[PDB]
């Protein structure tokens, strides 16, 4: 039963963890254990897009394709049933045999003649397949809207009857094509326009003979062309709604609701403040009674109108209004959007007269608002409220109303509160008067609730942190306390993280330039200019070359003279724990003495508003300091403990949730309320510096554990030791002693435990094994007998396995598989993408040499930029020099040794995801069988193993003469002993062409391999090839052996 603090450095792809044993006074005494869990960010690696978003987009295009095909099949069935075509016209699959491929011509010429069975059917099928866009808005523009509106205006203008006629006349003549091109949106029509064309076509063909203008046919065809499912089912909205603040049973009310709108208006009114002459006051009862009914009586309330109604004055202004903005009082103060919306609907539909109140009950307006906000289809709203209001009103409202956006409070609670607020009480007073003002703790943390954290990346980080927490609890019992350091990147969007990367790169460049300038100013400065020296110079210039405490001029040139100038913490660190740059000032060594642990307000006796305080305040106000810094330096009355806490704790939303959750839902045997503690990153780095652990030069994943260790030693007792030391240092008072450390030789112990090498030199050969590590700690830390114990094992990085059997089937581009007998595919490539290397592989290189030479010359002319070379159109010339036809894409050959059949077995695509590799042994040689996701989908268990030189048909066949050893998934731990070296890593990728494997070194040390990856390990002639098991915490590494070959299922 061990007293230990669990430190966690929670990154966006890693969780470093440490266990530090503690005293009876929460003192760090012994480093029990440490490790690093590493995993994949829960986002698309290339773009940062949501994984669920890509999945949803794939699903939605699946639905679109399915429903379009179903629409066309239904239309064919209807054409058969309405006696337009006979069974003779349809092929075995179910398609019309040899239907005319000119439905645009047949459409635009259906205005002049009768149509055959085929021509009519083709026109209908083409109209339904290409049915344009339907405005789904409730009611600045992109290509789609501009094109649709342009075509709508063109056919509405005259000289064109139907969009097909307009299309042929305009688009073909002026473009050379009717349908839209790569990024074009010009030739796009409104669904309303095509429906009009449909009704006109039916009536015209009715007169033009044409037996098949049946009512049934017309109705069916129109229904098929016009109908599409509703975006909101009629149950979605409640399913996404969320509970009330006060009554979790009741759901929150809609904004467009008399009660909720009244609540918003009462909040705004009761919270309004007015500033007259240096004073602040609320609106009086008579002022409030003057304004209350006005938003119902006017379109908008308008702060300026409120001023008019109260006859306020020119000297009186509204609080919280940017009056710099030129017509600040033109802002809407209140607008009963729902009230006036219902009113205007009934007014425009002739059931309401202007200058007359709404005749509907408050409850009725509530019902209308909630129904419209919860339901967006006529059927649903009707079924909900066609029972309780007149149908005329319902028709008007369905014609004109659109409501959204709920108000966080239930109608019940709102109805209780709104009278109480009506009689002049504030919101807090009302709900205090009505309502005044939790979960059992398990041993193991429960799953992180996705409801609270919506960032999937943060969700995965926290889930892996849960895995590590539960691991250390399972292994060592309940922790006494949990200390957390969430990275700055956890909880931010992809763009925010990219922005902070860009800004830190720019900061590195700026610091390089600043060091160069500092060197220019001080040619004889000794050594590299460190951050404190650049900061000294910056503070000099930014303080106008004046001592902040005294105002005496500072002598540049003596800047580096020891003790001449000090970078002082304005607020004492013993009392504030603030090491931010907003608390550092440049003072003369002379004057910053007898200052001690006082603040500028206390040092200069600002309590009595002395001359010195005013002078100091003027100095800091005139300086080039951000407002935050000026506010901090001039901090008058403050709380010691509170300020220490805010600087120590780091209360971003993920940290807040994490602390709350872990403390409330997991057993911790600690002293006092705060048994979960999230650390300020700046203070963690400060302690890291003072405790002796430099920023490691090496690139690997182990430094995370280092951070965790430091977080584990940020105990209240350690913190107060630091506080006492810094207080003494402030008062200048047991000789060179130094910053307090958790224990003697803390730095070296931690460095050896994390990296397996001494602190100084990273070129020592790592203590790869338990006994070697223990020998290293015993030798280098002989004074510390507690450095060696039964839990000391080398840090092995645990990598989250990924044994999912489902994935992308194939790449999304489909290539011609006609010529697959020879190892080639043919893909058709736009000229704006064609390159010399690609051009060498054009199918028609041999046939049409002139075109090839012209293309080559055009690419050479523009330094081989395909976009620039082919910005102006390219044409195939025809013996005599006359440009003939245009070229926009050409067929190119590509190598294709393998692939996946798609599109009714008429196309081929490259593989996407290798889900498994089965490992067999014959004789004393190893064989690998790859299994892709499409093989899993089709249910096929491959039987051919890889041979380097050959294609799959010449591959080694597997039968009962082969032992089956195991199955590898990505990130499975493997051992390869090849009589040249032993390699122990995580299986990353298998190479189909070579038969080699790639393995990641546990810590991804860039020294070994290609950025930590051993690309190209052969296994066929290996002495041993084995698969292992590892746990979160990177412990219990065991060999494992499968009995039978697993199915794909």
């Amino acid at each position: 039963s061990i007293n230990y603090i669990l430190g966690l450095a929670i990154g966006i792809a890693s969780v470093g963890w440490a266990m530090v044993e503690i005293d009876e006074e929460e003192n760090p005494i012994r480093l029990i254990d440490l490790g690093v869990r590493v995993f994949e960010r829960a986002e698309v690696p290339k773009t940062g897009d949501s994984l669920a978003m890509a999945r949803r987009l794939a699903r939605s295009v699946r639905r679109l394709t399915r429903r379009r095909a179903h629409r066309l099949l239904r239309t064919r069935r209807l054409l058969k049933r309405e006696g337009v075509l006979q069974a003779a016209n349809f092929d075995e699959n179910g398609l019309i045999k040899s239907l005319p491929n000119t439905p645009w011509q047949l459409r635009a010429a259906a205005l002049d003649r009768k149509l055959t069975p085929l021509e009519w059917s083709a026109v209908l099928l083409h109209l339904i397949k290409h049915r344009g866009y339907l405005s789904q808005r409730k009611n600045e523009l992109g290509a789609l809207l501009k094109g649709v509106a342009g075509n709508a205006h063109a056919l509405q203008t005259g000289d064109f009857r139907t969009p097909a006629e307009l299309a042929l006349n305009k688009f073909e003549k002026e473009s050379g094509h009717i349908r839209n091109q790569r990024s074009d949106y010009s030739h796009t029509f409104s669904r309303k326009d095509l429906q009009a064309e449909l009704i006109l076509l039916f009536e015209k063909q009715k007169e033009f003979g044409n037996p098949h203008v049946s009512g049934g046919l017309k109705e069916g065809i129109e229904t098929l062309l016009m109908t599409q499912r509703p975006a909101l089912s009629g149950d979605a909205v409640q399913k996404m709604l969320g509970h009330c603040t006060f009554e979790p049973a009741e759901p929150k009310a809609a904004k467009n609701t008399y009660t909720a709108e009244r609540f918003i208006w009462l909040t705004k009114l009761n919270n309004l403040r007015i500033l007259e002459q240096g004073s602040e006051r609320p609106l009086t009862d008579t002022e409030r009674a003057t304004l209350m009914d006005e938003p119902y009586r006017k379109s908008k309330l308008t702060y300026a109108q409120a001023r008019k109604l109260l006859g306020l004055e020119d000297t009186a202004f509204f609080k919280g209004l940017r009056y710099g903005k030129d017509n600040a009082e033109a802002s809407t103060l209140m607008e009963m959007k729902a009230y006036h919306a219902i009113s205007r609907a009934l007014e425009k539909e002739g059931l309401k007269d202007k200058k007359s109140p709404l005749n509907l009950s408050p409850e009725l307006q509530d019902e209308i608002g909630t129904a419209f906000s919860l339901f967006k289809t006529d059927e649903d709203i009707t079924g909900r409220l066609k029972d309780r209001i007149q149908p005329e009103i319902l028709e008007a409202l369905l014609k004109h109303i659109s409501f959204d956006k709920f108000v966080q409070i239930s109608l019940k609670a709102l109805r209780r509160i709104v009278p109480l607020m009506e009689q002049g009480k504030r919101y807090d007073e009302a709900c205090a008067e009505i309502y005044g003002d939790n979960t059992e703790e398990k041993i193991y943390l429960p799953p992180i609730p996705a409801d609270e954290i919506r960032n999937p990346v943060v969700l995965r980080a926290l889930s892996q942190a849960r895995k590590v927490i539960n691991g250390v609890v399972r292994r060592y019992g309940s922790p006494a306390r949990i200390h957390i350091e969430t990275a700055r990147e956890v909880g931010k969007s992809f763009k925010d993280r990219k922005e902070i990367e860009k800004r830190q790169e720019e900061n590195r460049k700026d610091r390089e330039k600043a060091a160069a300038k500092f060197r220019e100013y001080f040619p004889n400065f000794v050594g590299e200019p460190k951050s404190k020296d650049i900061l000294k110079l910056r503070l000099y210039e930014q303080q106008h070359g004046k001592c902040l405490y005294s105002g005496k001029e500072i002598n540049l040139g003596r800047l580096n003279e020891k003790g001449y100038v000090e970078i002082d913490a304005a607020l004492p660190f013993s009392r504030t724990w603030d090491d931010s740059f907003n608390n550092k000032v440049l003072v003369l060594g002379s004057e910053n003495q007898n200052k001690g642990n006082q603040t500028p307000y206390e040092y200069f006796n600002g309590k009595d508003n002395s001359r010195e305080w005013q002078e100091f305040k003027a100095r800091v106000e005139t300086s080039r300091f951000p407002r935050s810094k000026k506010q901090r330096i001039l901090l008058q009355k403050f709380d010691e403990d509170g300020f220490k806490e805010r600087n120590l704790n780091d209360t971003r939303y993920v940290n807040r949730f994490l602390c709350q959750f872990v403390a409330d839902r997991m057993r911790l045997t600690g002293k006092g309320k705060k048994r979960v503690f999230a650390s300020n990153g700046q203070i963690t780095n400060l302690l890291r510096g003072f405790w002796g652990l430099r920023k490691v030069r090496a690139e690997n994943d182990r430094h995370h554990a280092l951070d965790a260790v430091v977080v584990a030693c940020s105990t209240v007792a350690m913190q107060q030791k630091i506080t006492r030391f810094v207080r003494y240092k402030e008062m200048n008072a047991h000789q060179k002693t130094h910053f307090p450390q958790p224990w003697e030789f803390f730095a070296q112990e931690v460095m050896i435990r994390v990296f397996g090498k001494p602190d100084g030199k990273p070129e020592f050969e790592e203590a790869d094994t338990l006994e070697k590590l223990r020998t290293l700690l015993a030798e280098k830390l002989s004074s510390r007998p507690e450095a060696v114990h039964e839990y000391v094992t080398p840090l092995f990085v645990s990598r989250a396995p990924n044994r999912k059997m489902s994935g992308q089937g194939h790449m999304e581009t489909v290539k011609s598989a006609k010529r697959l007998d020879e190892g080639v595919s043919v893909l058709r490539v736009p000229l704006t993408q064609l390159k010399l290397k690609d051009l060498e592989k054009m199918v028609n290189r041999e046939r049409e040499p002139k075109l090839y030479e012209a293309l080559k010359a055009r690419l050479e002319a523009h330094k081989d930029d395909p976009a620039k070379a082919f910005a102006e159109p390219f044409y195939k010339y025809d013996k005599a020099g006359n440009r003939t036809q245009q070229v926009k894409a050409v067929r190119v050959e590509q190598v294709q040794k393998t692939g996946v059949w798609v599109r009714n077995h008429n196309g081929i695509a490259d593989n996407a995801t290798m889900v498994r590799v089965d490992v067999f042994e014959k004789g004393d040689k190893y064989y690998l069988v790859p299994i892709y996701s499409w093989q899993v989908a089709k249910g096929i268990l491959p039987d051919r193993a890889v041979v380097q030189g050959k294609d799959e048909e010449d591959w080694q066949l597997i039968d009962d003469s082969f032992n089956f050893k195991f199955s590898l998934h990505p990130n499975d731990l493997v051992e390869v002993i090849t009589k040249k070296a032993r390699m122990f890593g995580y299986f990353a990728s298998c190479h189909r062409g070579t038969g080699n494997i790639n393995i990641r070194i546990h810590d991804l040390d860039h020294k070994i391999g290609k950025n930590g990856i051993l690309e190209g390990i052969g296994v066929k002639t290996a002495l041993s090839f084995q698969k292992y098991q590892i746990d979160e915490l990177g412990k219990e590494i065991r060999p494992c052996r499968l009995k039978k070959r697993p199915p794909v299922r």
Partner: protein, 117 residues
């Protein structure tokens, strides 16, 4: 390590319009000398940053940095025919002995003028 200060005043004289080109040129000349140490001196190609502004550049002498800077400024000003630059020099002692408010005007008054173009 004797420190001087080059005070420059940049303005538009109205005779000829100032191209975005020339604005970026002058901004590049200025920003070559700015860093995080004196990032309040940074120049944008806006009229605000360029037209009618005082900038005091810190320099260590016994180094031809100041002279090259002033030469580039003078060349640009004479080439631009539509932008006026005035350059003064003051010792850093004198400069920090001046009051903070209206410091650059006082430094131009109390310094040695180098060129008015």
């Amino acid at each position: 390590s004797m420190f001087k200060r080059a005070i420059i005043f940049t303005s538009f004289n109205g005779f000829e319009k100032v191209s975005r080109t020339e604005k970026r040129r002058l901004a590049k000349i200025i920003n070559a000398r700015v860093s995080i140490i004196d990032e309040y001196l940074r120049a944008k190609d806006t009229n605000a940053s360029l037209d009618g502004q005082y900038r005091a550049f810190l320099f260590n002498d016994e180094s031809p940095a100041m002279t090259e800077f002033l030469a580039k400024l003078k060349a640009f000003a004479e080439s631009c025919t539509g932008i006026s630059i005035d350059a003064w020099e003051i010792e850093e002692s004198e400069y920090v002995r001046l009051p903070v408010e209206r410091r650059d005007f006082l430094a131009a008054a109390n310094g040695k003028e180098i060129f008015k173009i």
